[PDB]
Amino acid sequence: WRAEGTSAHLRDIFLGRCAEYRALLSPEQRNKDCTAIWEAFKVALDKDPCSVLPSDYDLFITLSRHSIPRDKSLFWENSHLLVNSFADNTRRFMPLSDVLYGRVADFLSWCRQKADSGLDYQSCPTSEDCENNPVDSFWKRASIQYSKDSSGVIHVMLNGSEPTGAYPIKGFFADYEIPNLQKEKITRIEIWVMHEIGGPNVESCGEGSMKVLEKRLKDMGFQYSCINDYRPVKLLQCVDHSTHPDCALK
């Protein structure tokens, strides 16, 4: 297999993350059974590493699903760390990584051995090794739920320094989230196209792939807007380049 082996101590981490997240939930929905949640997730670890479908995680979702505050959803592509850092544990925004069912698996890997019953810590199938592996099918199901339950102002953070452009036509955002947005409960979609400090400006609002994304969103009838290097996030990026002309203060 051509992808990371399952994460060491998967269960403790999962349960730990789940416990800490409960505290964030409001009491009226704080009653989440982390053990039951782990057992529903655990199902994919009993199947063939190439025979897991997004629907296998349905129970998991039912047991961990909770509401996402209006105008608090934050989608993204090629900016994982900047998103978690900026969102700051649900304080600023609530991206998938900061929603119960996403928090428990963020950055982790998992899959069962090809022929044995135990977990494969050596490697796990990549989308290329086979389409229906545990990790991809997981995110597809989680990405779908996240989009469906998002409302208000939809924020999206894309990478303008990414060599393949800011919008991957075949990413999770394009194939599993955009098609699941409830236009009925979405006011407008705002995009933040970020560039590395000094780093390359491969694409800015309205250029290359950004035209394709913008066109799709507008055809689907969404109110659309795009901002290059949205200030708050730029300031966070700047923390690591305090002495760079782009980061100098008045």
Ligand X SMILES: *[C@@H]1O[C@H](CO)[C@@H](O[C@@H]2O[C@H](CO)[C@@H](O)[C@H](O)[C@H]2NC(C)=O)[C@H](O)[C@H]1NC(C)=O
x-or-dash string of contact with its own copies, 33-72, rule CB under 8 A: -x--------------------------------------
Name, in order, each residue with C-beta under 8 angstroms of 133's C-beta and a sequence gap of 6 or more: 3, 49, 50, 52, 111, 124, 125, 126, 127
Q: Which residue from 240, 239, 238, 208 is spatially nearest to 226, judged by alpha carbons?
A: 208
Minimum gap (Å) between residue 152 Cβ and ligand X: 24
Q: Is 78 in the site for ligand X (CB under 6 A)?
A: yes
177 is in an annotated binding site: yes
Cβ proximity to ligand X: between 60 and 192 the closer is 192
Mark the segment that binds ligand X (CB under 6 A) among 38-46, 53-61, 154-162, 171-179: 154-162
Cβ proximity to its own copies: between 14 and 101 the closer is 14
Q: Is 97 in the site for ligand X (CB under 6 A)?
A: no
| Residue 161: contacted member of ligand X, its own copies, none (CB under 5 to 8 Å, by partner type) | ligand X
Cβ proximity to its own copies: between 129 and 246 the closer is 246
Q: Is 246 in the site for ligand X (CB under 6 A)?
A: no
Q: What is the DSSP letter of 174?
A: I
CB 102 within 8 A of CB 139: no
Buried b (16+ CB within 10 A) or exposed e, 53-74: ebebbeebbebbbbebeebbbb
Q: Which residue from 41, 20, 49, 51 is spatially nearest to 101, judged by alpha carbons?
A: 41
Contact pick of 27, 118, 163, 245 for its own copies (by CB under 8 A)? 245
Q: How many residues does the chain have?
A: 250
CA–CA gap between residue 164 and residue 168 (Å, rounded): 7
Binding site residues, its own copies, CB under 8 A: 8-9, 12-20, 22-23, 34, 85-86, 88, 92, 231-236, 238-240, 242-243, 245-250
Binding site residues, ligand X, CB under 6 A: 78-79, 81-82, 159, 161-163, 196, 199-200
